[PDB]
Ligand binder design. Structure first.
Ligand SMILES: CC(=O)n1cc(C(=O)Nc2cc(CO[C@H]3CCCCO3)cc(C(=O)O)c2)c2ccccc21
Ligand SMILES: CC(=O)n1cc(C(=O)Nc2cc(CO[C@H]3CCCCO3)cc(C(=O)O)c2)c2ccccc21
Lengths: 113, 113
């Protein structure tokens, strides 16, 4: 039993704190476009894309029933980037920065719920 | 014989240093849109518009043959902004800061190649 308008109250500050990271969030504010980014093999590796805009729209439009689905999506987005990208690349490091932030934002919110 | 991914690795640090200027890079991260910004004389004054998202695209999709073409697109972006906006304007002052930064990051990079 979980309602998605309280989930907005509860979880959106955590999402907002990822968007707040600048410039680290910018490669995550939109879906990965493999041709435009010059990474045509992206979907030979990643099979479930995720990004901040998809996560925000799902919060905004009730596609999250429980809060662990939001959490798993946020980790899917980061995992994808750690899976595809080189460890020395800026996008990898940006991923690790957002992940750090996300871990500290999300714990008290989830310990509450 | 500069290969696309060689230019991308060498030059993209300088593009990151531009994005890291907040708020100064904010008006430069997407193409100037006259309707949305209410400036219908923009294209009567600026003929070769340039912005960070275009420059990034060209680097991502190997559209630069040599480093001086990138350096040219960055300066074109600055010169358009100084040309169009009044000296007292936020956009002009922001531009000035982005150029002082770029000058400091482009130096070791061009020598290095
Ligand atoms: C999510 C993901 O894995 N990626 C995301 C990439 C990427 O550059 N995304 C990106 C990055 C940016 C701007 O990010 C800046 C951040 C500072 C470094 C210069 O780029 C804008 C957009 C967009 O408006 O569509 C997209 C990317 C590039 C190469 C390999 C992987 C990439
Ligand atoms: C590059 C250029 O010449 N311009 C860039 C202008 C501009 O404000 N672009 C802009 C600027 C911003 C960010 O605006 C910031 C500016 C500083 C902090 C307050 O918000 C976002 C967008 C967008 O959402 O597309 C666009 C602009 C406005 C008037 C005249 C010229 C302008």
């Amino acid at each position: 039993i979980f309602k998605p308008e309280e989930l907005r109250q509860a979880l959106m500050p955590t999402l907002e704190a990822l968007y707040r990271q600048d410039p680290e969030s910018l490669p995550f504010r939109q879906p990965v476009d493999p041709q435009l980014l010059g990474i045509p093999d992206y979907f030979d590796i990643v099979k479930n894309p995720m990004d901040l805009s998809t996560i925000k729209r799902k919060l905004d439009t009730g596609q999250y029933q429980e809060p662990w689905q939001y959490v798993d999506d946020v980790w899917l987005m980061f995992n994808n980037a750690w899976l595809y990208n080189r460890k020395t690349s800026r996008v990898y490091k940006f991923c690790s920065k957002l992940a750090e932030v996300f871990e500290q934002e999300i714990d008290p919110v989830m310990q509450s719920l």
